[PDB]
């Protein structure tokens, strides 16, 4: 279990014991309980730290991107969409993972794929139920340049085929870093010269997702938008860091704008 400490009954004291006094010049932080600073009763305490595990904290699906593509190519979305895999284009999921320096985990990817009708000068629409492909292309694979090209044959590339009006499709991904954990922060460079990309984006090379309609275009236009959700599973995290204080600027840098530590108060004494 994850059950917390009980309070221990304590009486009056008058001794040379000094639990309250300490030096904080040591890296050590005090271990004092209420049973050291006042009377206290015995409390049998059944509260658990069950949901404050890192495998419950990080284990809820979070949207990491959405990308759009259009049958008509109505508003410059092409007939397929692409996304270079990263976790840093969204504030919320990024912040949770950046409370740790190294994380090894498996992922679970869920896709929520929706479509909508577009304005057109077309008359009479009775468009069949759309099918969509989501193709994962590992680093150094051939890439789509059109919706019709040979790369969508998926002979070794992992791929999902899914039809609208069905449960969101999902696939597990295993741990797959070159290292023994994913690196959230890298204080190095990509060159021995100490030039080029600086930061964690040096070590980012996680392939690219491509997504298209599998159906041929119909006389109107449909735009489909695919939202990608990652959930960490089976997590071990190492080296705790402060939570972010500043809002992010960029998905490849930590650059930040100088921001206040805390919010205002009127004075030292407030009620």
């Amino acid at each position: 279990m994850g059950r917390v400490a009980d309070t221990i009954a304590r009486g009056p004291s008058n001794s040379e014991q000094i639990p309250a006094l300490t030096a904080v010049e040591t890296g050590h932080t005090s271990q004092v309980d209420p049973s050291d600073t006042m009377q206290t009763r015995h409390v049998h305490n059944y509260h658990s730290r069950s949901e404050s595990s890192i495998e419950n904290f990080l284990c809820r699906s979070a949207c990491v991107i959405y990308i759009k593509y259009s049958s008509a190519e109505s508003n410059n979305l092409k007939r397929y969409a692409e996304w270079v895999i990263n976790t840093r284009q969204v504030a919320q999921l990024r912040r949770k993972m950046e409370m740790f320096t190294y994380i090894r985990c498996d992922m679970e990817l869920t896709f929520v794929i929706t479509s909508h009708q577009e304005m057109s000068t077309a008359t009479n629409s009775d468009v069949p139920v759309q099918t969509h492909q989501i193709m994962y292309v590992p680093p150094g694979g051939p890439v789509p340049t059109s919706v019709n090209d040979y790369v969508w044959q998926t002979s070794t590339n992992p791929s999902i085929f899914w039809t609208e009006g069905n449960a969101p499709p999902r696939m597990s991904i295993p741990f797959m870093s070159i290292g023994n954990a994913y690196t959230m922060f890298y204080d190095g460079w990509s060159n021995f010269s100490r030039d080029g990309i600086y930061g964690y984006n040096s070590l980012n090379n996680m392939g690219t997702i491509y997504a298209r309609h599998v159906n041929d275009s119909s006389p109107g236009g449909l735009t489909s938008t695919i939202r990608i959700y990652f959930k960490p599973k089976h997590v071990k995290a190492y080296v705790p860091r402060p939570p972010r204080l500043c809002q992010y600027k960029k998905a490849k840098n930590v650059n930040f704008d100088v921001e206040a530590v805390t919010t205002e108060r009127a004075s030292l004494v407030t009620t």
Partner: protein
């Protein structure tokens, strides 16, 4: 996968089903239980408790405390009938807004005996005797004290013990009756008569009151949950 075949009612939401569903707060640690006095486990623990019965629920008396008390006096004759109402503890005006009767209007069926307690709230120098009667149906309500004592009855004697119970037994063709009034499920009649008179000294009041209580016995049950007709709304409360 494993060969399976879907059968009727595969996607239905039945509101009386019980199925398992994933929690939306996995591994949530609930507050410890503690003993809170007065744990209820059944609604027959509420129905078996006495509740004052409005036996004097005439138009003027509805919003007053007159509803729960029926005057009884020192008569110059024998004195007639004091009250009477059709028994039906879920459909009668008298019995249906009591604790027993409002636990009954969440159900469509009921069975078992119930007990009407009566209490004399006169002076301690006032004394009387009353005939508390139950008549099974099929011959109408008794219109004389003679016809009332052919039924089930308890003759109440007012004394130190201030109350007397007329236990009214189940006596039914069917094993259950409907909570709603139905002529097949007719449940009998209750009445009260003077057996003697209220006799009292000069310096003590000639009029007294009587209250009635109702509760289920230990053989009582209900079946088939339904919405109550006693609460309603025309738009959401805000």
């Amino acid at each position: 996968g494993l060969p399976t075949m879907l059968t009727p009612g595969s996607t239905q939401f039945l509101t009386s089903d019980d199925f398992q569903s994933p929690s939306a707060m996995p591994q949530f640690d609930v507050t410890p239980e503690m003993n809170i006095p007065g744990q209820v486990r059944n609604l027959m623990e509420i129905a078996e408790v006495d509740s004052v019965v409005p036996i004097n629920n005439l138009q003027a008396n509805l919003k007053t405390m007159e509803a729960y008390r029926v005057q009884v006096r020192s008569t110059d004759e024998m004195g007639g009938q004091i009250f009477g109402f059709p028994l039906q503890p879920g459909a009668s005006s008298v019995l249906q807004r009591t604790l027993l009767g409002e636990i009954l209007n969440y159900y469509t069926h009921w069975s078992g005996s119930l007990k009407l307690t009566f209490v004399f709230c006169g002076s301690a120098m006032a004394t009387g005797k009353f005939l508390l009667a139950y008549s099974p149906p099929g011959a109408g309500a008794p219109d004389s004290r003679k016809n009332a004592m052919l039924g089930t009855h308890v003759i109440w004697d007012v004394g130190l013990q201030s109350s007397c119970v007329l236990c009214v037994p189940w006596i039914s063709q069917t094993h259950y009756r409907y909570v709603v009034d139905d002529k097949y499920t007719a449940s009998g009649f209750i009445s009260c008569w003077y057996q003697t008179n209220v006799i009292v000294p000069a310096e003590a009041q000639k009029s007294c009151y009587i209250m009635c209580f109702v509760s289920a016995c230990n053989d009582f049950s209900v079946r088939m949950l339904r919405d109550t007709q006693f609460i309603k709304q025309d738009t959401f409360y805000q």
